[PDB]
Amino acid sequence: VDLERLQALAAEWLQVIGEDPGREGLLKTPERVAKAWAFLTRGYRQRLEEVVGGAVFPAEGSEMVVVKGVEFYSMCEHHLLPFFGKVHIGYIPDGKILGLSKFARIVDMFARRLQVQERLAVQIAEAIQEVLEPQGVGVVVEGVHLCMMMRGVEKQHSRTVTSAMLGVFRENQKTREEFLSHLR
Amino acid sequence: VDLERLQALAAEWLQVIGEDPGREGLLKTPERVAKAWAFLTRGYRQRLEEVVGGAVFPAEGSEMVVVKGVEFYSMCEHHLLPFFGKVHIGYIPDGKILGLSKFARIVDMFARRLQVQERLAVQIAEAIQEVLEPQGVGVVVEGVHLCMMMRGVEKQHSRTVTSAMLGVFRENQKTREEFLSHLR
Amino acid sequence: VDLERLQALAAEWLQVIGEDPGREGLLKTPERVAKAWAFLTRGYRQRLEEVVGGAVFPAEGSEMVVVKGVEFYSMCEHHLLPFFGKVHIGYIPDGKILGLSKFARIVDMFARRLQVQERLAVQIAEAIQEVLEPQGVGVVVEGVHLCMMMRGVEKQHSRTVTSAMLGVFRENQKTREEFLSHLR
Amino acid sequence: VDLERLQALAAEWLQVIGEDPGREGLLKTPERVAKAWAFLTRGYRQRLEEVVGGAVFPAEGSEMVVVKGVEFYSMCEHHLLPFFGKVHIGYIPDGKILGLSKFARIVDMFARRLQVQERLAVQIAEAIQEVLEPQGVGVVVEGVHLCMMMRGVEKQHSRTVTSAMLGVFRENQKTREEFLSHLR
Amino acid sequence: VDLERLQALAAEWLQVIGEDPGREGLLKTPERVAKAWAFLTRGYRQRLEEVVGGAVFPAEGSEMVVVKGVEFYSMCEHHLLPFFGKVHIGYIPDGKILGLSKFARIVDMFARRLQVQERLAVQIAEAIQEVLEPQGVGVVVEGVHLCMMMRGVEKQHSRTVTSAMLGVFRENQKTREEFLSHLR
Amino acid sequence: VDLERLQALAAEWLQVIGEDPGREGLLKTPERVAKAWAFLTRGYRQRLEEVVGGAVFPAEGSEMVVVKGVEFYSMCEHHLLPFFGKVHIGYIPDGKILGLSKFARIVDMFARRLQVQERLAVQIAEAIQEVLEPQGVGVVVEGVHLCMMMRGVEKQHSRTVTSAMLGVFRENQKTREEFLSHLR
Amino acid sequence: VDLERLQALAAEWLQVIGEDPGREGLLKTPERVAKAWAFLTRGYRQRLEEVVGGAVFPAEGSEMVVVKGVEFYSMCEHHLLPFFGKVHIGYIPDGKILGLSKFARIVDMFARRLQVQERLAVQIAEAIQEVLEPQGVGVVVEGVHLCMMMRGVEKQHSRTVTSAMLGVFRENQKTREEFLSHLR
Amino acid sequence: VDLERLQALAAEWLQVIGEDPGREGLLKTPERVAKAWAFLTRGYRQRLEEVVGGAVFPAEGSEMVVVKGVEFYSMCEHHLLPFFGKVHIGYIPDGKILGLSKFARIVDMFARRLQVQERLAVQIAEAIQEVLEPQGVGVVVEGVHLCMMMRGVEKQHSRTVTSAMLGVFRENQKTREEFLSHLR
Amino acid sequence: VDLERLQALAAEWLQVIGEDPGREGLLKTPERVAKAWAFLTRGYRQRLEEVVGGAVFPAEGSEMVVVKGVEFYSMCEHHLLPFFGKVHIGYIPDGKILGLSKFARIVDMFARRLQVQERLAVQIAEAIQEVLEPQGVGVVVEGVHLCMMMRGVEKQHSRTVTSAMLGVFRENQKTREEFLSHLR
Amino acid sequence: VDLERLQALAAEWLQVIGEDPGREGLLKTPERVAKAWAFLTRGYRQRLEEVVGGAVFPAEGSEMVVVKGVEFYSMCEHHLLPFFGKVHIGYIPDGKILGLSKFARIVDMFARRLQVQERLAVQIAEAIQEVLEPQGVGVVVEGVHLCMMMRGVEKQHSRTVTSAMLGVFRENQKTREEFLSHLR
Numbered sequence A, B, C, D, E, F, G, H, I, J: 001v002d003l004e005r006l007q008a009l010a011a012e013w014l015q016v017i018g019e020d021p022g023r024e025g026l027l028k029t030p031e032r033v034a035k036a037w038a039f040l041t042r043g044y045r046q047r048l049e050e051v052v053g054g055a056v057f058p059a060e061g062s063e064m065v066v067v068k069g070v071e072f073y074s075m076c077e078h079h080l081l082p083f084f085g086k087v088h089i090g091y092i093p094d095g096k097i098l099g100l101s102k103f104a105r106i107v108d109m110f111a112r113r114l115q116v117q118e119r120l121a122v123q124i125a126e127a128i129q130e131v132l133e134p135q136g137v138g139v140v141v142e143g144v145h146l147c148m149m150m151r152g153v154e155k156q157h158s159r160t161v162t163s164a165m166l167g168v169f170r171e172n173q174k175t176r177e178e179f180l181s182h183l184r
Ligand SMILES: Nc1nc2c([nH]c(=O)n2[C@@H]2O[C@H](COP(=O)(O)OP(=O)(O)OP(=O)(O)O)[C@@H](O)[C@H]2O)c(=O)[nH]1
Pocket: B076, B077, B078, B079, B115, B116, B117, B118, B145, B147, B148, B151, B152, B153, C052, C053, C054, C055, C097, C098, C099, C100, C101, C102, C105, D028, D032
C-alpha cells in the first residue's frame, strides 16, 4: 500500500469537503488517515497459514467448543463506514482443536477488509473448516452499522445477525440449536 | 396533500376543543400540524421500487439473515393516535440479498400511513418477498399503542406482537423457531 | 349494589376491629369503601357483547397475535384480599381479529369480581373464544397474592401462573410453545 | 365540546390526507377521534376544587412527602402529538397533607390539555401550593416527545426534564437536593 | 376482636355485592375474612415493651446503624385497601443499641392497623426514640398503594415516600444526608 | 461540495488500498461515499439562525430545563473516523425558552463536521447561549471513539466526557451540580 | 422438644468453643438457641392433613398451575448449617386444585427439618401427589448452601438445583419442558 | 477446641430435636459439626501480628485506598445463626500501606467468632488502626441475618449496615463522604 | 515440590526481565511466588479417592441434580497465564449421589494444574462418572482467558465454553437439553 | 530481554512443579512464556515522550475532560500474578489537551511492569502532569487481584480502588467531587 498516494488523496479530500488542510489540527491528518487505512485493510495481506501459526492440537474430547463474544470491527464496502459487534464461533472437532486466540486472529483477518456482513460470517466459517476439518462449524456475526445509524435511514436500535453453518452444524438441526442456545 | 386545507381544519380543531388559535404558543400550530401529517402519511405516496434503490446484491451464502430492532412509528386508523416499537426481519435468500438500510426504508413506507398492527407486519413481509424472492421471510412487529395507554382502558404495561411468515418461515417450523430464538 | 348498606356494614366493621368511625380520618371511610367495592365487583354487571362493542375486524393475516402484559387486579374469593399481576393473550384468527383494547376490557370484566386465579384464565380464554371463534386461544395469568404475602404463610418471593389453552393452542404443541416463548 | 363538529372535521381530515372515509376500518374513526379528543382535553373543563374533593388532612408530621412515578400523557401545543413520561412531586406540609391520589388527579387535570412541558411542571406545583399552602413544593416532569421521535429530528434516546420549585424547595438548597436525591 | 360479628358482617357483605354466600367456594369466606382482619389489626392490641422484649444492648460504637429493606404491609384508613413496601431505619445510639429483629417487630406493630403512610413513618420513629433514647433516628417508608392502582386514578408506576427525622437526624443536615445516601 | 471530485478520489482510494474498483459491489461505492461525506459535513453549510427557526418562546418559569440523551455522531479531525454517543444540555432561562427539538438540530449542526470532542461541547453551549441569552447553559458530551477502538490502542471499555459551562452553570457550583445530578 | 436439655447443651457448647457463657450478651443465648431449634425442626411434628386444612377445591380447568418463588430455609443434615433459596411447584390437576398458600405450608413442613436438598424436592412432590392425586406434579428446588460458602471449599458463586417429577411430569417430556420453561 | 466434646454434644443435640444419630445420613454429622465450629470460631485463636505477617509497605501516595466487597460470614452471638455479606474498607495512609489481602485476613479473624454486627465493624477498624496508624480508617459492614430471615420475624428483604470511622474519616466530613460514595 | 529451587528460578526471573531482586518490594517475592505455584499446581498431587472423602450417599430420587456456578481458576499450559470462570455440573444418579461440596473439590483438583479448557471439562466429567457411576453426567466450563486479554489478540469481550457429556447426557438429547436449559 | 534465558528458566519451572516439558502441549510453552513476559514488561523500556507522539493540542476550553473505562492489565510485584480492571482519568487543561488515545498508551506504559496498585495510579497521574501542564489531574484505578482470588484468602467479591489527585483536583474539593461523580 502506497502511503504517499493516500496522503495526497486525503489531503485533497479535506479541501473538497470544505476544510482547511493547512489548519493546525489537520496538518498530520493525511498521514494519520493513510496509516489507519493500511491497518484497516491489512486483512487482505495476511495468510491463513501464518495467522493460525501451529496452534492445532489433538482433541481432548468430541464435545462442542464455543468461543463467543469475539469483538470485531469492519468497513462496509458500500459506504466505507465502520460496522462492528461480535462474532460467535462453535465447532465439534473431528480430531483436532484450535488454539482459542487463533479464532480471534481469523476474525480480524477477514474483518479488516471492505466487507458485507453476510460474507464475513461465511469466510470465517470456511477458514475454520479449512484449518481444522471438524465435524462441523457454526459462525454467528452480530453487528451495528454506522451507515444506517449516522446517515441514511438513521435508525438507532437496529442490529444485524448473519450466520454460516458447515458440516454437522448445517446437517443436524439439534446441533445448530444447541450452539445457538449457548449464545443466549 | 393540501396543506392549506389541513391548516384550516387544524385551526378549527383548536377552537372546538376549547383552545385559542390566537394564543402565542398556538399561532403556528395549524401550519406545523399540516406539515407533520403530510410527513406522517408520506408512505402512501412512496414506490417500493424507488425505496429499494436497486440495492439488491448477489447472495453471499444460504444462511438466515436477521435484521432486528428497526424502530418504527405509525398511527392507528381507529383513533389516529401513534403506536410504535420495533420491527424484526428474518429471511433466507435465494441468490439475492437486500441492502440492510432498505429494510428500514420498507418499514417506514408502510408505517407512515394509518394502520392496524396486524396489517403492518403482512405488508412489510410481502414487500420483502416481492423485492427479493427468497426461500422465505419472517416479520415480527412489537409495539405499544397510545390509544390503549393515554385513553380508553388506560393499560400501562401492555405490548402487542404481530407477525407474518412467508415461504420456508411458514413451512419449516424449525426455521421459524430459529428466527424467533434470535429475537430473545 | 346498595351503597347505603355497604356503608353501614363498613361503619360497623370499623367498630368491631377496634377503630372509631367518628375520628376525622375515618369520617368518609364507610362511603369510600362502599364505592370502592361497587367498582371492584362491577365485572359481574357487565355484558361481553357490550364490552367488545363491535370492534371485531376482518383478519389481515393468519399469523398469531400476542397481546402481553395487560395488568389486572382482582380479589380472592377466599379472603377478599387483592391478587394482581399481568394477563398475556395469544390467538390465531379464523377470519376475525379483535380490537386490541377489547382484550383489556374483557380482562377487567372478569378480574373485577371475587376470583380464583385458575378460573380467571379460563373465563378470559372462553370469552375470547365466543367473540372471535378463532382457530385457537391461549391465556396466561401471572399474579402475586396478598393473602399469601401480608398474612398466613407470609411468603414474599412467590407468584402464581395459571393458563387456559383452547383450539389449536391446546392441540398444537408447537403453536403453544411459540406463544409461551413470545412471553419470555 | 361539539362532538358532531369534531367528527365532521375528522372525516374531512381523512379525505385530505389521501384516505377513504368509506373504508370499513375508517367508518367509525371520526366518532372515535371526536370522543378521544374530548377526553384528551377534559383538563380545561375541570376545577381544582372538585379535583381535590376535600381530601386535605391534618399533617401527621413535618417531614417531606414524595409521590414519585405518576405516569402522565399530554399533547404538545406545537404539533398536537403526544409527549409522556412521569411526574414526581415533593412537598413539606404546613399543617395540611393531601390525599395521595389527588396528586395524580391534579397531574391529569393539567396533562389533559395542549401543553409545553415547562408549563406543566409549573401549573402542577402552583396547584398544590394553592391547595395545601405548604412550606414548599417541588415538581419534576420527565418525558419523551413524539414530535422529536416520530418526525423532525427523529432523535430516539432523548428525554426532557422540567421542574418547578416553590417555598422551601426554592429557598432551601438542601431541601431541594434532598428531594432530587429521592428521585435517583 | 368479636370474630362472630365479623363473620356475620362479611356474610352480609357477600350478599350485598351480589355474590352467593351459599356457594361452595364462599362457605368458609366469612370465617377466613374475620380471622384475617383480626391479624391485620393486631397491632392495635400490642405494646411497645413486649414487642422489644428487653432486647436493648450497650452500644458497641458511635456510628449510625441502618436497618433497611424491612418489608411491611398495611391498610389505608381511607379505603381499607392494602398499601405496602419497605421501611428503612437509621439511628445514632446514645449508649444503647436495639436487637435488629425488634425494628421489624416495631414496624409490624404500627403497620398492622388502619394507617396513613405519613403517620406510619412518624410512629415507627417515635417508638424507636422512646425505647433507645438515641442521639437521633430516621425512618423512611416507601410504598405502593392499591387504592391508587386497582381503582380511582388507577396509576401504575407511582410509589410514595414518607419519613420522620428525630434528634440529630432532624437537626444535623449531614447526618440525615449520610443516612439517605446509604439507602441509594 | 463537488461530488464528482470526491467520486474520483474515492475511486482511486479503492485501488490504492488493494481493492478492485471494477468489482460488482464497489461500482457504486465512489458515488455512495461522495454523498455520505457531503451529508456528514453539511454542518459547515448550516446557519444557526435557520437551524433554530423561530422556536423561541416566553419562559413558563425560571427553573432549570434539561434535555438529555440527544444522540450524536461525528468524525474526529485526526483520523476521519466516527466518534459518537450522546449530548446532555441543561439551562436556566432568563426570559426565553427554546423549542426542544432545536437543541437536537444545533447538536447536529456542529457534530456533522470534522471535530474534537472538547470543541463540540463548547460550540454547542455557545450556540445555545447566543440564541437564548439565558442565565446559564451547561453541555455534557459523552462518546466512544472508533479511532481508539478499531485501531491504535484498541481499547474497548473507554468513554470520553467533555463539557462546557456558561453563565450561572460556570458560576454557581450548586447549579452545575444539580444539572449533573439529573444526568445520573 | 425438651427445651431445658437444649439450653444446657447450648450453654456447654459456648464453653467448649472458648466463649464465656456468663457474659452479658450470652446470658440468654442458650434459651434463644433452644427455642430457635424447636422452631427449625417443627416440621417433623407436623402432619400433611392439618397442613392442607382441607383447602382442596374442584379443578377450574385442565391447564398446569405453577406456583414459583416459594422461599424456603432448611438445615443440612451433614453440617447443621442453613441452606436456602426457592421452591417452584407445577402440577396438572385431576379434578382437584390446592389452595395456593398450602403449597407454601407443605414446603415449610419438609424444610423445617434436617435435610438433603435432593430429598426435600422429592418429599414436597410426594406430599402434593398424595393430597391432590393430580395427573402429575413437578418440583424444582434451587438453593445456596452455607456449608459450602462459609467453610470447607468456600465457593461463593454456586447454587444447587434438585427436582422431582411425578406422573405426567415424569413421563411426558413436553409437559416437563413446559413447566421448566415457565421458570425461566 | 475439644473436638471430641463438641462431637458428643452434637450427638445429643440430634437426639433431643427428634432425630436419629444412628441413621446413615447422620453417622458422621457430630464429627462434621465439631470440625465446622472449630473453623467457625478460629478467629478467637488468631493473633493480629501473625494475620498481618508483615506485609506493611511504605506508602506510594497520600490518596485514599478503598478495598470494597470483601465477603464475610459470621455467627450472631444471640442465636448462633449465620449472618453474612460484605465488608468495605477505606483509609488514608500515614507513610504505611497494607497488603491488600491482609484486609481480608483481618475481616476473617473477627468474623470467625460469635458476633454482633455493630461490634464487627469497630473491631476491624481498630485492628487496621493499630497495624497502620493511618491518618484515618473507615469500615462499613453490610449483611443479611438468618435469625431475622429463617425464624422469628421472618423478614426477607432486610439487610443491615454498620460502620466505624476513625481519625480523619470521623473528623473530615468530606473524606467520609468521598469514601461512602466510592461504595455506591 | 522443591520450594528452594522455585525461589532461585524466580529470583533469576526477576533479574532477566529487568527488575531489581534487591528492591524492598521484591525481597520476599521469590518465596511468595514459590508458595503460590506449589498451591496452583497442588491438583497433580491430589487423589480422587481422598478428594471425595467417602461422601457418597444413597440416592433420594432419580431426578437430575445440577450444581451450577462453581467458580474455578486455572493456568493455561500454553502461556502459564490464568484462565477462570465457572463450572456447571449436571447428573442423574443410579443409586448414588455425591456430597455437593465434593463437586467443588473435584473441580479444584483438576483446575489447579496447567490445563486446556477442553480437557478440564472432560476430566471433571470422567472423575464424577468414576465416583458415582451415574446414569449420566454433563459438565460445562465457561471461562475467560488472560492470554487472550492481557496479550496477543487482546480481545476483551470473549469467553469460551467447553463441555463433556457422558451416559444419558450424551445419549439422550432431551436430557442434555434439560441440563443446558437449567444453566440459562 | 534475554528470551533464551527466560525459556530455560520456564522449562525448568515446568519440571519442578511436577510437569513434563516433553509433553506435546508443553513443547512450545517455555518459548511462549518468554515472549509473553517480554511483552508484559515492555513498559519499563518505553519513553513517555515517544508514547505521547507529540499529540498535544491547544485547549478548546477550560472545562474538565474525563477519559473513563480505560481497561488495564498488570502484574503484582508480590506474587507475579495479574491484577486488572479500569483506569479513569480526569483533568482541567491549561492551554493544552492530550490526544485521547495517548491516555491509554500512558496507562499501558506503567501497567506493563511489576506493580502495586497504589503506585500505578500515582505514576499515571504524574506522567499526565508532566506531558500536559494542566490546572489539575485526577486518576482512579479500580481493579481485581488474582493473588487474592485464585489463592491465599480466595475472596471473590473484592475490588480495590486507588487514586492520585494533582493540582486543582487535590486543592479544589468540589472539582474532585465533580470528577468522581462522573464515574458513578
Ligand atoms: N387489532 C387491532 N386493533 C386495533 C389497532 N389499533 C386500534 O386502535 N385497535 C382497536 O380498535 C378498536 C376500536 O374500538 P371501538 O370502535 O369500540 O372504539 P373505542 O375508542 O370506543 O375503543 P376503546 O375505548 O376500547 O379504545 C379498539 O379496541 C382498539 O384497541 C391495531 O393496530 N390492531
